[model samples]
Target: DAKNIKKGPAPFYPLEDGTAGEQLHKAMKRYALVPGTIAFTDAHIEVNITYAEYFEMSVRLAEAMKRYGLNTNHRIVVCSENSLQFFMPVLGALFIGVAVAPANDIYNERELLNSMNISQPTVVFVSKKGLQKILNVQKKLPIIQKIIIMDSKTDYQGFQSMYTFVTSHLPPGFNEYDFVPESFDRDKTIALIMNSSTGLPKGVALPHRTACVRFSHARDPIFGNQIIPDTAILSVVPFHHGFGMFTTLGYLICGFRVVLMYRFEEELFLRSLQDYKIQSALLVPTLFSFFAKSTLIDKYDLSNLHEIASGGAPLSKEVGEAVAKRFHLPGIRQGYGLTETTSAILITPEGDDKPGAVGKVVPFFEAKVVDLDTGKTLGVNQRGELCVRGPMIMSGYVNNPEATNALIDKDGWLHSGDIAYWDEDEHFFIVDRLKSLIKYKGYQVAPAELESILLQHPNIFDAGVAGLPDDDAGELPAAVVVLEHGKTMTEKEIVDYVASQVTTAKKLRGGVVFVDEVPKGLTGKLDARKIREILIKAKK
Candidate 1:
């Protein structure tokens, strides 16, 4: 029975006695023809789509893809802020074996075209606002063939309305069309790309096996979704991202409903949770910060909510503790993952909250911290580059061998580019990233470590740290701080505040600057690289 099964060292968290596609395939058998099983409704309009209705919409998109001759190798780019129609087309493309790339939909004309040129997608789907942005650079993107517009009331030329189509009228002879095989190779490509919080977005080539394994792994250990059938998920994460995919597709496959929010408007975000009677939610640190600080915290009843898991970026201790105290719940749990890892690697084990530490590696994963110079493994509490090995890691970056080789090594380990260490208890704590670490007189300084200490000051609302040129040290660490509204503090006072807390190597020797807002990356993480760039530009 194991014949022809390509094998590696057994997965630490192996799929539970089944093939990669087995579970989702089994669900399809029971619900394949059931059109009304999964629904997507308008949060603002109060409209609901049954499972069957959603399938019908997907079929319409499939037919559209056929008309345009899109196939496995051809990419379909999706650029939209957040909307139900944005997802419908993506699912439709997947059903037909076409790869989909979801761009942030927030890029300006030049930035948008750069992504389009890199992806070289056969077709693109966008909302009206996104369409106008692309049109600004239309002359530059020769690779894109067609543009499908969602909710285009103006009926702009060369654009098709994605939501106006109905799939009830299938061509009579369509049944004779050859299918692309019901079962896909588990290790074959599924989704083509994902956004990285740092650096240029990478075109991640995830095999079906990796995607399915990630889904199964998340449903079990991460969300611990054994109770999914009895729960409804309130999602604030954008659908185009992996977090939303997990709660929507992964949770739904196990028989759960999700209340989707188009955007995080404070009132709507709070009301949706109560309206849906949500039992659990996936959140970012910023949302938790607001919830903990808001005066109207008691206005909405969050009693039904059992868990509020925070990821996408590190959760500060203050915000984490406040939410836990107010809710009479455990502290905010954190997850360590990247687009390359299919969004999960380490899940903070339930009931195991070690402040500043991301929990133990979940079942079926192995990790090691290595000295970058010597390739020697480091022991507990010794910070080094984090390398992970797991079934959930992506196959490779699409057609980018040099990048792939740089990230994944010959030993089959994925170098995370993150700086972290394990405690004696084997819990992981991440400092700043290796690339983000500042070199001060040959001494390494972590920006995250300094920022964390800076955040503890009463007057500081937020802080970002980056490297600045120093005459003797090669580079020293500088801080950019945002004070709380109506609060004031001098730069020297802030410097002294942190100076008293950290060691000489970790001190803010490069001085400080006050700014309105610290720049953030795509996933809301501190953008140290961009901040450093800003500092360089300001000097010029």
Candidate 2:
């Protein structure tokens, strides 16, 4: 049966030059092309683009970036929802060897400014809706050179529209004579930074080799030949995030079409599914939750859909079963990985129906659960910290060797900071996050960061925060506050206060509950475990 499974070519890419980086580049170039294929739908609006068109547009866009004086090694900050232009620019930047720093569009000015300060991008791509909002904080961002606006029809003299630039001429000698230097290093840095929505978003510098290897491994029989070449994907996730990046690049490499949407409105998504006759899609857990909970579940005819992959958060049985029953297809499945792991280290294939587990370790990655106390590898069904060793593990955290050292130990294993247990069948199930972090709709939400911010409020005497499991979001940040005597604040007031300071994911959506005192351990430190226990009891 294993021999019968379809697999990609051995040695993946055979470079004429025989170098790792060259082979990867050759593979990317070879796959960049697809014939005239249908891509997007807005219930009525649908479009198609060819492989040549995709490659040419990306090259032209790179030339435009050159015209603006940005080069291969420069950092470009991309902060847009999702669009065709957004897709092109990302690839364009990568092809030219420039590292892209993607920011969540939902981030407020303060959060945006922090990311910009850290990335120090040569240019920032601003989507139309958030263009003016970013402009308000433009004065504070000293490192940003120019802002290229997407989704704009008009040519706003100072800023270039992605629509205009994709049609422009390419610079001479680009991607031809020296497409990639002969000694190209696959381990050379390609993508500069990714922030896990935890604490302060840290920079993840991913090497070209890391992405290439992960891409290769993801093309297993589970996903490889299963997808129809002509099928289109309806993507509502932000391209700036890891999930979107993987889906876009993975689909492109397989010669599949993508239906891009800037935002996720249920009505629009449902309409596009039928209009585009979408065959495949990827959704975060929160979006899946919405689908499961919405009355529209039975309204749309999703019979043509072949694959639905959910990640970025844990999937519940309720949500999973709802999807399977409603569509009469395989239920929603789970994958486990972080930003540092290039999206996934483990995944469940269509037929691998293992419930309550994140599925088997991806073919190329080696996964082991180790004792947290003794650092010894645990046997099957033993609970411990999850460690991953694979080509997909990031090169290291950018500019933070200390943190990197802690993450990827001397053994070359990247510590996932997640606690898990394996079943007798070797199916891995993620039970808890090892770090004191919460996932708000698959985005990491740091309680310490929120608590620190809350302490700044004049009325708050002491504060502690923890995650409360929710049916929709994997976990929601709930604050237990000890207020100054006679000072009054409503739950909405505290929620709005935090929302003003942090990014959208960090917003305290769980609502505040008044407490006499935040429970403490023997050492007098905030006992998050005990606090979580209290919240669970309160809910019941």
Candidate 3:
């Protein structure tokens, strides 16, 4: 509609019509000749699974889903740290046309309930970390009929075991068994129900077409393809996150071997890189920060760590340059994406990235920057709101079109809450945010979620939450609280109260300020911009 609408190269592959599950099946079919090749390894537990083994397990999983009466109409959840069991059910459900929501394992019961109701999953598979939390909130969700413990060989509370379920004796042998899934409208079918940290917590439905087109293809048309075939990579970013799921699945689909890591254990993270001779990896700013700032990075032989990409948050120019020089790499590839965009819509081309820029717009993606207030398209180097449209963008928020209507314009451009600008070179830079969500480490912490928890305290009469910029964490959740008449409260009490109600990232790391009245509009909407100003003033 306007000038300077940047676009990427022609698609590496055509937009085919099929579910992501079927795309995976095709990859499995191609890899069948070399069945013994290791597809996934959990070195922490010393367990390895082959491509043939993984495919057979998933095939069995799909067969079981059919037997259990699940379909494209139903949804399932895997709320766990990364594991073979976690990966198996997801692919299995995909094969049968059922969408799977990969969820964080660290959610408390209160947060768990919000995530659970999004898809109203019929069955949720939980590893030990998420097991008790989901069980605590199970009574609230009537749809969860089965709870399969992922790490166990035996059932828990009469629920099944992932180990036992996949190994269950079928009428036929796993090798000989072939289950052809029913046809589905891939573009219309919801393949993955992602709970985004970017907005007020809700399910962002990523259709199968997005998965197949954006990630499953061997050559990355959207972003530049730098990760070569069979690159041994690390997968610490949990499967629940959009970045983690898309990249990990992409690597596997293209025959790249991966070593799975559940969480960023500082020691394990570096050790795994050296041990696996990892050629390339998808890491966050903090994970890559070790290479730049920590002396601990010197101990490990990361010579094979020639390529890395940072997402979830941007790496500052200084930090990116430091890591690049230390690793002797050309650039630290960063990508601009959100759950709404099905992961990255921009990526640094191999050896062709500026210090801090994410990249040019990806293949099939058209992006523009508009004046934040006027909505007029802005030229290069002018800071404004980022908006994009592409094949990979979300279908919309799950059954919540009103909210979707607000985010995506009538012209189909998704208005990113991110404050960004593209340089003359067409590489986009995210300098700040227009939204109230706090990004801690790499995950988003919705300020409203924290503020609601803060308001529940007996002493808190009024409250507002703002993100305080942090060097280590992208931003920390800080609160401005007004106490009740004659009531007294410590900052520690306010912090712990909110911490107890939410996940760790949502904790009040930015601390708290006691204020008489939080800046608010006439309509009582919290003035996030002013509150942030107040927070910055207090921090100074």
Query: lDDT per prediction?
Result: 0.67, 0.68, 0.77
Most accurate candidate by TM-score: 3
Candidate with better TM-score, 1 vs 2: 1
Candidate 3 per-residue C-alpha lDDT over 361-465 given as tens digits, one digit per residue, 9 for 90 to 100? 777788999887899889979888789998888989887999788889989999876677888788888763234467888889777778878888899998889
Put down candidate 2 lDDT per residue, 1-540, tens digits, no spaces: 222111223423321333323443454456454345443332324445555656665656666676656665688888887766676667667666677888888998888877777777877777877787677667887767677787675666567777555444445555532344233455765654776622466778876666666555444556332445567778776677777877666666556667877667787787777667788677876777777777775678776687677644556566778876766776655677677877676776557777777776665567888887898887767788778787677877777798889789987888766677777666778763224698888899778789989999999987779998898888988888889899998889999999999999898887787787887532124667667877777766
Sort by TM-score, top down from the best: 3, 1, 2
Off by over 4 Å in 2: 1-35, 39-45, 66-69, 163-183, 223-227, 432-540
Q: State the lDDT at 311 in candidate 3.
A: 55
- Output the better candidate (1/3) by lDDT: 3
Tens digits of per-residue lDDT, candidate 1, 175-228, equal 312322233455665654655543456677666566666656556634356544
Q: After superposition, how far is residue 423 of candidate 2 from its true place, in Å?
A: 2.1
| Candidate 3 ranges with C-alpha deviation above 4 Å | 154-157, 166-177, 197-200, 216-218, 221-229, 433-540
Candidate whose lDDT is highest: 3
